[PDB]
Amino acid sequence: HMKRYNVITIFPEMINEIFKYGVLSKGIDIGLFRVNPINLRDYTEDKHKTVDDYQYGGGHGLVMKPEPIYKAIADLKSKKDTHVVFLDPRGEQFTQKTAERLYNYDDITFVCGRYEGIDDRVRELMADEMISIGDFVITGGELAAVTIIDAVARLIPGVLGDSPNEESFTTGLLEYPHFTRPAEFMGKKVPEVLISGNHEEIRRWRLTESIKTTLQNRPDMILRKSLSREEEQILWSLT
Amino acid sequence: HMKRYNVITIFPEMINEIFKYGVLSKGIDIGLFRVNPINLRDYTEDKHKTVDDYQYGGGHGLVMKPEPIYKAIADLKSKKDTHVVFLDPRGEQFTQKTAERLYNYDDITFVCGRYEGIDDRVRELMADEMISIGDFVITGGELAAVTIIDAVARLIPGVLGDENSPNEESFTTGLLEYPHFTRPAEFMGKKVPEVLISGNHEEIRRWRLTESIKTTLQNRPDMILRKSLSREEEQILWSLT
Ligand SMILES: C[S@@+](CC[C@H](N)C(=O)[O-])C[C@H]1O[C@@H](n2cnc3c(N)ncnc32)[C@H](O)[C@@H]1O
Ligand SMILES: C[S@@+](CC[C@H](N)C(=O)[O-])C[C@H]1O[C@@H](n2cnc3c(N)ncnc32)[C@H](O)[C@@H]1O
Ligand SMILES: [Cl-]
Ligand SMILES: [Cl-]
Ligand SMILES: [Cl-]
């Protein structure tokens, strides 16, 4: 089935503008997935059409009200089943494994907070899970939503050109360096093996550089990786 | 004099459109910072305006060419000193500590790749550092750039008003934050915790700190381990597990 990603946000047009750029917009154009911005302001009923108000506990910090977010999610669910993700720093830290897990859903609803956060009762009532884009804080869930959609949708066969099979994190490693023309640029030659080597020599050089980069930059990934005999010998030879 | 973030990208209009929205767009309006999309295609010099080409090593996977990126960065540097960040999965995993460190700079240039990545020679020549938005891969550096800018620019005093305080929030404190609530006091039979409605400032502080430690313990025990817990935090933790 076509993968669908609903984004509940006070800035739906931001979501539409973002997805008219790049390889992903072509996948939308041909129907491999679809992004569905939902205007949270459409689910207000008060005279001031209110989606945020002063929180409880003191001060004037703003928190997203529960009723509009509840109504927006219930509206989606009334038409078609969906998997509800609240974007929240308290959630699961988003990694390539998360993206592979979310890939299995055909219909995901992302709820975007603003200001101090989202009233936690509607999260308790409606969320299937919480996901954090990383160990940092941004002003809204919008950027976290589109980033996740990007990471998940690009795994749909046919979205990228004929590869996401050997890239960083997918392999449990950081990828080798890449180069293109010209062969010489400001005194730096492209490694000769990539110009004139055979397949196995290029594979060996890339695997070596990949392990090197991972050991130097992300030793924690090395510890988590189940190494092939060949990868382990290379790792030993750099230590 | 304000903070400036330049974004080298083949999609400058995407960057422009993103910062029309939300609290950051008001910060730009009153001149607390500025975002400058830099059109990488303006720095090609060949007849096909080429920013990417087939990589070396076999196949037709595309890699961003070194010359336009080099020319783009040297142009900025000829105008003003700037700190050059290559967006790349191999870089430092972006955290709140990273955002706090980058806040120090008054001018930051982000280099956005596409396709298989960026020719690593221009990275080696021009990058002051590489940063990864996280342990996953996206189609382009654009989203990583604007996300980092968001996390950094929101720390500029005055960008956020009374609507949110960045001094006490997730990760900044080493913890995950407590739950929040707003009107109405009762929603579908679920009541806002009474302490937030009628407790005093100290009672609210105690409850919030407890829920924060509980949430961090349940969701991110790794964060508990690396935080130097205060005497009070230590005891709350013990009075749980
Ligand atoms: C400024 S944040 C509120 C964060 C909250 N005060 C805290 O410290 O945990 C406003 C909105 O941005 C989104 N957001 C901010 N950081 C996020 C992150 N790391 N992961 C997912 N969403 C995030 C969330 O949807 C959140 O409701
Ligand atoms: C599809 S990625 C290529 C990544 C490379 N093939 C690898 O496996 O490491 C294309 C561009 O998106 C950006 N990008 C992808 N993932 C990123 C991340 N985790 N952090 C920062 N930038 C990222 C980079 O600028 C990169 O040049
Ligand atoms: Cl949850
Ligand atoms: Cl570097
Ligand atoms: Cl410690």
Q: Report the alpha-carbon distance of residue B32 to residue A48 in Å, rounded.
A: 30
- The environment of the single-atom ion ligand 3, i.e. residues with CB closer than 5 A, is A 127, 130
Q: Do B65 and A91 touch (CB under 8 A)?
A: no
**Buried b / exposed e across A164-176, counting CB within 10 Å, b at 16+?**
eeebbbbbbbbbb
Question: How far apart are the C-alpha atoms of B227 and B123, rounded to whole Å?
Answer: 34
In contact, A152 and A102? CB cutoff 8 Å: yes
Cα–Cα distance, B135 to B95 (Å, whole number): 12
> Domains plus CATH for chain A?
3-153 (3.40.1280.10), 184-238 (1.10.1270.20)
Cβ–Cβ < 8 Å for A52, B23: no
Residues 6+ apart with CB under 8 A from B153: B3, B5, B24, B27, B32, B33, B159
Residues in chain A: 239
Tokens of B3: 């903070």
Comparing CB atoms, the residue among A119, A138, A147 nearest residue B181 is A119
Angle between helix B96-103 and helix B141-153 axes, rounded to 10 deg: 70
A74 touches chain B (CB under 8 A): no
- Please say whether the beta carbons of A190 and A183 come within 8 A: yes
Q: Is A118 on the interface with B (CB under 8 A)?
A: yes
Give yes or no for a contact between A137 and B171, defined as CB atoms under 8 angstroms apart: yes
- What is the C-alpha to C-alpha distance for residues B131 and A128, in angstroms, rounded to an integer? 31
Nearest ligand, measured from the Cα of B230 = 5
Amino acid occupying residue A221: M
> Is residue A182 reached through a cis peptide bond, with omega within 30 degrees of 0 on the bond before it?
yes
Q: Where is chain B discontinuous (C–N over 2.5 Å), named by the preceding residue? A: none
Written as one letter, the residue type at A196 is: S
> Which token pair is A32?
């491999």
> B-chain residues within 8 Å CB-CB of A22?
11, 114, 139-140, 142
Residue B104's identity, in one-letter code, is N
Return contacts of B124-128, CB within 8 angstroms, 24+ apart.
Answer: B124/A188, B125/A186, B125/A188, B125/B66, B125/B70, B126/B69, B126/B70, B126/B73, B126/B74, B126/B84, B126/B86, B127/B84, B127/B85, B127/B86, B128/B83, B128/B84, B128/B85
Q: Is the CB of B112 under 6 A from ligand 2?
A: yes
Which of A17, A147, A180 comes nearest B65 by C-beta? A180
Sign of CA dihedral A14, A18, A19, A25: positive
Strands, DSSP E only, in chain B? 3-9, 33-39, 52-54, 62-64, 83-93, 107-111, 129-132, 186-187, 190-191
Q: Could you say which of B119, B125, B162 has the minimum Cβ distance to residue A178? A: B119
State how far the Cα of A74 lies from the Cα of A102, in Å rounded to an integer: 21
Structural contact between residues A88 and A130, judged by C-beta atoms closer than 8 angstroms: yes
Tokens read off for A178 = 């890449």
Q: Is A132 in the pocket of ligand 2 (CB under 6 A)?
A: no
Cβ proximity of A148 and A110 under 8 Å: yes
Return phi, psi of residue A145, to 5°. Answer: -60, -50
Output the DSSP codes for A65-119: -HHHHHHHHHHHHHHS--EEEEEEEEEEEP-HHHHHHHTT-SEEEEEPPBTT-B-
Tokens read off for B34: 């500025």
According to DSSP H, which parts of A120-198 are helical? 120-126, 141-153, 192-196
Which H/E stretch holds residue B23?
A: helix B22-29
Contact of A160 with B137, CB cutoff 8 Å: no
CB atoms within 10 A of CB B161: 12
* Burial A179-191, CB ≥16 within 10 A → b, else e: bbbeeebeebebb
CA atoms of B111 and B120, how far apart (whole Å): 12
The structure was resolved experimentally with X-ray
Number of A:B CB contacts under 8 A?
264
> Is A179 within 8 Å of B94 when comparing Cβ atoms?
no
Query: How many angstroms away from the CA of B170 is the closest CA of chain A?
Result: 7
Residue A188 · residue B124 · CB < 8 Å: yes
Indicate the resolution in Å: 2.2
Q: By the 8 A CB rule, do A32 and A102 touch?
A: no
Q: Which residues fall within 8 angstroms of residue B2, CB to CB, at 6 or more apart? A: B31, B32, B33, B34
Cα–chain-centroid distance for residue B51?
26
Q: Hey, what amino acid is at B47?
A: K
Cβ separation of B17 and A22 shorter than 8 Å? no
Rg (CA), chain A: 22
